[PDB]
Amino acid sequence: GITATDVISAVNDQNAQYATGKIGEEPVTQKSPYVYSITMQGRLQNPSE
């Protein structure tokens, strides 16, 4: 009972873009000794995925 449109929206949603930010790069509310960053790869590389 899966229509072809469900295939399109499932691929459109599970193969997303990317996401990146930093933790404490903007003006300090506390004296942080160093700042790190976070990433997120919402992209499928292998066909097995």
């Binding site: 790069e25 903007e26 003006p27 300090v28």
Partner: protein, 49 residues
């Protein structure tokens, strides 16, 4: 941008973006502080065409 309404309550009241965020006008120094002879100074770089 501060009086944007988020939730409409069953009692007529309105929850707004001011009660949930702060809308500062760009700039955001202390992401890139400037200096001049030790004192704080905002620099403009005149790039030759």
């Amino acid at each position: 941008f501060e009086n944007i309404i988020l939730r409409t309550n069953n009692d007529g009241s309105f929850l707004r973006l001011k009660d949930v965020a702060d809308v500062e006008i760009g700039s955001q120094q202390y992401s890139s502080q400037g200096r001049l002879n030790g004192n704080d100074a905002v620099p403009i770089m005149i790039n030759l065409q």
